[PDB]
Amino acid sequence: RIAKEALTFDDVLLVPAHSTVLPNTADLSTQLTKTIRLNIPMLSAAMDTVTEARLAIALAQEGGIGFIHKNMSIERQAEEVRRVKKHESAIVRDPVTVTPSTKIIELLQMAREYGFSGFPVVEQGELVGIVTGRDLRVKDTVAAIMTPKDKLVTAREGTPLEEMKAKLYENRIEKMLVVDENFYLRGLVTFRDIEKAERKPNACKDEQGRLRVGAAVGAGAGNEERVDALVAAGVDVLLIDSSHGHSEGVLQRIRETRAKYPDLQIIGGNVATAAGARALAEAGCSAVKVGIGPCTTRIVTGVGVPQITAVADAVEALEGTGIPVIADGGIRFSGDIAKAIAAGASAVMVGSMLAGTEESPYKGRLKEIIHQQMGGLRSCMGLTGCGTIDELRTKAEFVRISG
Template sequence: MQFLDQEALTFDDVLLVPRYSDILPKDASLQTRLTRDIHLNIPILSAAMDTVTEHRLAVCLAEEGGLGILHKNMLIEAQAREVRKVKKFESGVVKDPITVSPKTTIRELIDITDKNNISGMPVVEGKKLVGIVTSRDIRFENNFDHVVSNVMTPKERLITVKEGVSRDQVMMLFRQHRVEKILIVNDQFELRGMYTVKDILKSLSKPQATKNENGQLRVGAAVTTGKETQDRVSALIAEGVDLIVVDTAHAHSKGVIEVIKWIRKHYPDQQIMGGNIATADAAIALMEAGVDAIKVGMG
């Protein structure tokens, strides 16, 4: 065994000596850049472990300004669903709200709202918005075989806005009309999204949250180098995952580098992290393969 004839230290061997400071804690900033496109208000990512990170922790951490990394020890569909839960939890705009048709029965409507934990849905015919139905509309409904068109608020009484309207304008409409949902439409009155007062208030109460350009909480997800990795990556990206983490115990390997190159080739704008590594050569190899961030530390 070879011994190095020089001082070697670990983290436990080192202490920082406190010195005078004229900076108050409230004036300190912990903002950092995880990748070129992802900024964090606190430099904390969660471990991609099945005992640590699923959607509940990912939501909490993103709300505080960090980023949760969903573990990969589940079926592809389950991990994609975890991403969807984070994305749906809070957003300035719900880009693809769940909808029903005028012919949907009250029984079917209740089943959908219970499964998705929502209180109301736009009603559409094709792409055209024709109304909205909420829990208030069916609260005293006894005949569950009635269809939605019998109880919904019709389009003539809806509060709608066009795409690109400012948040201040949306808040003014909420206060003016005392509604809980405002629908976004285009010039053809096709549904393009939805604001909810609940989401707006949540957003205002968490100004430090880590969000994308659509006001959705950001989330990462881990993948490995197995046979189903390409399908898993595609499913995660389809749900809007912000960061793919190619997560292995030893990332300076052919399998990891090939996965990173595949993701970069097929999804050139996707943010990618690779790890774990412990050497400069490994960092260079992952950067050349196309990662945006590197996870350092082994053992």
């Protein structure tokens, strides 16, 4: 009964091809699900050491999409989603505000805590002043030291980012207040954010232009109050994440959630076989995750399928569904990403890679890791003659290496 043969990343190499593709001109975009299109093929995994609201924003601005983890309160997990959801490429709807009668003592705690010293001043939604770093080098309430209503530089909602950069610079100020017909605060946008959005203009957003975001839950029932709470928080894609997704209890959860939310984008995981991939698709998954022990699952449980064979078997299973496959774990170096995609994955998940970054809960700023990795994928596509992630997943051939 002891026979088949299966292949991992280190077992294969990608062959070079005639190419007209250049690294800086390859297109890194890919359909995560039939309705969500990433600009880079990367997801951050929902681990308490990788992804909360901070990194999810950082990654969606890069082109990707982060997944808030369930090792936190139901209510704290929903507010994380809302925090990403209230983000644009570079405008912050629902900023952290103050009121005129905020004491200035209580105001320096907000800045010591929040890391930015600049807040719009409000009065039940009506914008009323603004108080920033410069207005604190003295001692009373905000109202004494705030820049009053009549001198506020603002922009109506809809005005393009350039018109606000013009305005911000002409007025020699760092914070633009987005404002209503009735002067109700609708958004805050710094000079920092507009520069960081003219470069890297490939944020992954929905049809309302707001940052896309995922969230994970486990299966096993009882998660209904949670699954409902992240939907209510307007998550883009719900992750129903399992150590073994071909079990009946997981298929069940997925069947149930698809009933209560016919258009919500769901990833089920993790499978490792064509059967699991079909059953996860058949229960209602928008995309399936693949990663059974690629890892103590192997040493402890004795169970696993190496990623190269697992991905390509899930993908063969699902031809003609439009249900994409995510490769999850086993990721050592950058070229492993390229192999995973070449084996037919439409995106990859990573978590250990990003677990020490700045924007995560030994460090780095996210934009540099994503750059080194995405430059590696760019190299590969130029070498394989593959302009789009579409081309790579279907064109590039493999070669088997030994030692």
